[PDB]
Every structure is written in structure tokens, then in C-alpha cells.
Design a protein around this ligand. Structure first.
Ligand SMILES: [Zn+2]
Ligand SMILES: [Zn+2]
Ligand SMILES: [Zn+2]
Ligand SMILES: [Zn+2]
Lengths: 360, 360
């Protein structure tokens, strides 16, 4: 039925047919004093969306509404709200929808790494409800995770930042991506793109590192000071020896990426940071010997503090990311999905046209 | 014969009988304009010494004089010397005996990571000679790697710093080991000890992390604010969850050290740094998933700049390391070796009594 009691959205019915989501009606999460209800109007299709649906993460309780690069308007503030959000205000939600907010890690701004962390969708809250939202009309989120969206940034062009962009940003900021640093982006995909842009925006000689050359042109349109085609190198680590300060590996899987060569290209003290989460059956594997004065680590999402920093940056220096809009709906999602697997996206798919798909 | 033309020392004759070195006479490295000849009077027995001799590193050209925690006196400066060393001066030499000194990494103070790096022993120079020195009367080293040894630091108590100590120091300094930081030392062995001391000396709440409790008493005598016995924990990473900033793993091998638990105990941004080099057939193996906001890397020796920093620190705050002297000679080395394998050392063995073992 109408808003209040029931939410509607394009939802997965079975991992078996994850490519065919059907519009569905479901009960929202119980509303809490700090929660906020946001009427959605745009949602970036995140690679994670695809892996989840396909069940690459495991068997998830269905039905299931995916999507977590949300940009909608505030349509109802809970009793104890104090974040300073007004009703009808333009807001965003990313991958995190809950945290404890009391631990050291939260107070210290590392909510993605909280003991009691909960993700936007597919995860049951401490009370049982399995997080939904995304490819739907409304999403119910705790105010700490809802953010203001700068005026100049358009919805379809902001949403992707709530997750993908943030994901690249966090490690880039945290590891000094800035003036005079040499940064490599491994995998000019959805997240790969924003990182390439975000990276430059920060003033770092950005190198884009892909396999073929299919994307050389784009990487360069994006402002990448350099591009590297692995298949055309034999030993790129050898050629680019001692050049990088930081390399953020953001690629769907971690198979076609030899991790015994990469270190060579890192400066003493260099850092390789992966943004990936592949089909569980996968593991990041590399020869130990090589981590000689070069560290390797993994990163998850970012802290809302940073999510804000990014939005601001994307806003202040007019960062135009590459998005191709699709119409929300059993179809749009389908295409969206279909294509994302084929890798047939000009980097980011932002679902829109929410207004004319759910009605009243 | 006498000094000039031939050097003498206790040398390995075959990996097969690496425990029975025999006093030997061998031709020094050709003398070069910056080289320096140091008459040895003390040399710390380094774990590396043991692995090399045993052939854990591979088949090495024999005879072979091991030892690279050298402390002797300057007995001959080469033509172009300018380091400012005087003759008869007290000096030290560690594991590095050569570098290019022109590359970025050298000028930038990372000579251990130089393209043309050469180690004190077992390595042929760009000209062919296989680096010796250590358990001998004289060692011939390029001035860049010979260092002044503070007055107050006794020889047998300084030598171990030239390698072991430096090895722990480097990563500790480089990763902020200091006031208000929580640091863990994994493996209270030779290097483990100095690190425990050095660490405290710098003002870091030092935790010592070993297997049994056999060393609890010592670790505490050393000033360790805490001690942890793995075998008595079941899940120490769980108990010490989110506590460490840095952990330096300095243990002979890397087998009895589960690396899927350690990350848990690291703070977001924490760092695990190994100092180990095990019997080649070995590899540092751990579940990928865990490097969540925690990085893992490896480190080699230190930069002479740091080697100096350490000597200074050990000197200014009177750091007494744990050394048990032995008499250089077919015997002393034997015992030294024998014991080091059994692990029967109160941390560091410093060979001495060089004066009365080689004569004229
Ligand atoms: Zn995501
Ligand atoms: Zn928390
Ligand atoms: Zn050594
Ligand atoms: Zn060099």
C-alpha cells in the first residue's frame, strides 16, 4: 500500500534468476528515533549490487532490494533527529546504514570498521530485519548515514559517489593522494573511473593501469597523466620500477592481476590497497618475498566524514563522473544488470525516473 | 700472511659441516679509493649468520667467513676517504657493505633497497669478489657503511646493534614507534629483544608476543609493559582486538605464527611488518580477507642514517642489550652456532677476544 506501511521496489526473487527482478511490496524496517525516511529519486548501480544478486556473496534471504548509491529527499524525520536535516531536503545514503556510534572506531571516524556494522542491503539489523532499499521508492536509514548533497551536483551524477567514489576516495585521502605523489588506479571500471578523476582532482600524477588499450582513450579524456596496458608490457613493474607512492586496485575480480610484479613499481614505502571483494571462492594471492618495503592492505567504504569531504570536493572543482542513466523498473534493472556483467557500461549506471514507476 | 695481503678468520668449509668452521687464510677484496680496512675486535652472532652457513639461503661459494655485526678499529683509509673517519678510530659495520650511492633510493636514504646492493658476506661484488668479513681479523668495507661508535657504548654491547637492532629500529622509526603508540614485538629472540628495548626507549607501550611463558620474566625485566603467551590464549587477536598501531614480527621462521588472527588485534590503520627471511622453501601465508584496514609488509636492514640514529639513542639513554660473549675461534663459533640453533642464547652472542686468536 501507500508509503507509511509498505515500500515498493524492483527486487530479486531468487539467485537462480537474479537477472529478472520483479517489482515488489515489502514491510519497511521498524522505524527508530534517529531513523529517517528518504523518498528515492536516483540510485547508482554498484558492482556490489551485481555480485550480491548473483549470490556471489552467498545465499541471501529473498525477496531482496539491491542498490546503495541512493539520492532522495527527506520525507520524515524521527523523534530524536539532530543531524540538522530538514524535510524535503536533498540527501544521500551509501553502503553503510548502521553503526554503534559509541565505540572508539566510530567516534574516531571509522564506522565502516565497526563491530556492529550493517550494510545498506542484505544484512539483518541487530533486531532481525534484513536491510533493503536502493532500487525502490523509499529507504529507511539512521540519520548518521544520510548526507546532504551539494546544490551544483546533479542527482544522477552524485549517487555514484555515495559508494564507488567514496570507496576510492577513502584510501586515496588516507594515503596522501595529492600534489607531487604518483598514484596508480588499477581497473578503469565504475569505481576505477571515479578514482582516476578524484585522484587528479586532488593533484596527483595519476596513472591508469588496465589490461588492453580498449580504454586508453577514455582514461586520457579523464585527465590521466599516463595509461598502461598490461597485455602490452610483459613486465610493467620492471619498466615503471620505483615510481608509485600509492596504487589502489579496484577491479571486480582478482584473477587476471598478477600480484608479484606490482610491488616492483612501488617506491620504498609505497602502498598497494585493494578495493575488491570477489566471488568468495577467490583470494588475493602473491609471492611473499615482494612486499619489500611495500605494504599491501584492503579497505572498505569510507567514513561519512570522508563521504562529505568527497561530495564537497566533487562539488568545489566541478567533477563530472561518467554516468549513463537508465529507467528504474523490471527492465532498467535488467539492462543495468545484464550490461554490468558484460562490462558494457561507460563506467556508472545511475537508475532514475523513480517518479514515474511506482506511482501512489 | 700478515695483514696487507691476506685476511684470516673462522670460515665455513662446507654447508655439509657448517657447524665446524676452520680458521682460514684468504685474499681480501681489491682495495678501492673509498674502502676502509677495519681491524675487528668484536662481532655479534646474527641469526642470518646461522641460516647462511647452514645453506638455508642456498649453496654459497666456500670457504666463507660469516658475521656482520662488526666493531673494530680503522687501520687504513683509502685515497678518496672523506667520511671524516680517522685512523685508530672505533667503527662499526653491519649487513650492508655496498650500494651505488647515486640512485634516488640511496640519496633518499634507502640504501638497503638499492638496485646494486651488496651484503657484508656471501655476495659477489660487481667485480666478482664474494664478500667476507665478520668472524675474522680484518674486514674491508666502503666508508659509506662504516660508522662511528659512541664512547659510552661497549664493543660487545654495540656490535649487535649494527644489524639486529637496526633491523628492528628501522620499521619502528619509520612507522612512528613512540609516545602514545601501542607496539607489539613478535618473537623475543636476538632481534626480538633489542626491539623490545629499543621500542620502550622510544616511549611506546611495548607488548611482547611469544608462544610459551618461558620468556615472560625476561620480557618484563626488559621493561615490556605487557607480555602475551600465544599457546595460552586460543585467540589472542580476539582478546587484544583493536589495540596495536604497529607490530614487528621478528622471528627466525614463519610457521608457528598464524597470520589470520594477528590482524584482528591491529587498529584501523595498524601495520604488521616482518623482519624475517626463512629457509627459502618457506612463505608468509595468511587469509586475504583479514587485511581489512591493516597492512602487511616486509623490511630489510636500515639506512646508515638510521643506524646512526640508533647508536645515538642506545647511547643517550643507556640501553643495555643482552649479550653473552664467546671467544672467537673454531670453538667459540661452534658453540655460538650450536647454541643459536638450539635457541640457547640469552638473546645476543657477541664474539670477542679477537686480539688473542689470530696473532701476527
Ligand atoms: Zn558498493
Ligand atoms: Zn562502532
Ligand atoms: Zn643480519
Ligand atoms: Zn643505489
Amino acid at each position: 500500500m501507500s508509503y507509511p506501511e509498505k515500500f515498493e521496489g524492483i527486487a530479486i526473487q531468487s539467485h537462480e534468476d537474479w537477472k529478472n527482478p520483479k517489482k515488489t511490496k515489502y514491510d519497511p524496517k521498524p522505524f527508530y528515533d534517529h531513523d529517517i525516511d528518504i523518498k528515492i529519486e536516483a540510485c547508482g548501480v554498484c558492482g556490489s549490487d551485481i555480485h550480491c544478486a548473483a549470490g556471489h556473496w552467498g545465499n541471501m534471504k529473498m525477496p531482496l532490494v539491491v542498490g546503495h548509491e541512493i539520492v532522495g529527499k527527506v520525507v520524515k524525520l524521527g523523534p530524536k533527529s539532530n543531524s540538522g536535516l530538514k524535510v524535503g531536503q536533498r540527501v544521500g545514503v551509501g553502503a553503510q546504514v548502521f553503526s554503534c556510534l559509541e565505540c572508539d572506531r566510530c567516534k574516531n571516524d571509522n564506522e565502516p570498521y565497526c563491530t556492529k556494522f550493517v550494510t545498506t542491503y542484505s544484512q539483518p539489523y541487530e533486531d532481525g530485519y534484513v536491510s533493503q532499499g536502493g532500487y525502490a521508492n523509499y529507504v529507511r536509514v539512521h540519520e548518521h548515514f544520510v548526507v546532504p548533497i551539494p546544490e551544483n551536483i546533479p542527482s544522477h551524477l552524485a549517487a555514484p559517489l555515495l559508494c564507488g567514489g567514496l570507496t576510492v576516495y577513502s584510501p586515496l585521502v588516507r594515503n596522501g593522494c595529492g600534489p607531487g605523489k604518483k598514484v596508480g588506479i588499477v581497473g578503469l571500471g565504475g569505481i576505477g573511473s571515479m578514482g582516476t578523476l578524484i585522484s587528479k582532482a586532488m593533484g596527483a600524477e595519476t596513472y591508469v593501469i588496465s589490461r588492453s588499450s580498449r580504454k586508453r582513450e577514455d582514461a586520457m579524456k579523464m585527465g590521466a597523466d599516463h595509461y598502461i596496458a598490461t597485455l602490452e608490457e610483459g613486465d610493467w613493474g620492471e619498466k615503471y620500477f620505483d615510481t608509485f607512492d600509492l596504487i589502489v586496485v579496484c577491479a571486480s575480480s582478482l584473477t587476471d592481476i598478477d600480484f608479484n610484479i606490482m610491488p616492483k613499481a612501488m617506491k620504498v614505502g609505497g602502498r598497494i590497497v585493494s578495493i575488491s571483494i570477489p566471488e568468495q571462492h577467490e583470494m588475493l594471492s602473491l609471492k611473499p618475498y615482494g612486499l619489500k618495503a611495500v605494504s599491501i592492505s584492503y579497505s572498505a567504504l569510507g567514513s561519512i566524514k570522508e563521504l562529505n569531504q568527497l561530495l564537497k570536493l566533487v562539488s568545489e572543482k566541478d567533477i563530472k563522473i561518467w554516468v549513463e542513466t537508465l529507467p528504474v523498473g523490471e527492465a532498467g534493472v535488467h539492462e543495468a544488470f545484464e550490461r554490468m556483467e558484460k562490462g558494457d557500461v561507460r563506467y556508472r549506471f545511475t537508475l532514475v525516473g523513480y517518479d514515474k514507476e511506482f506511482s501512489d
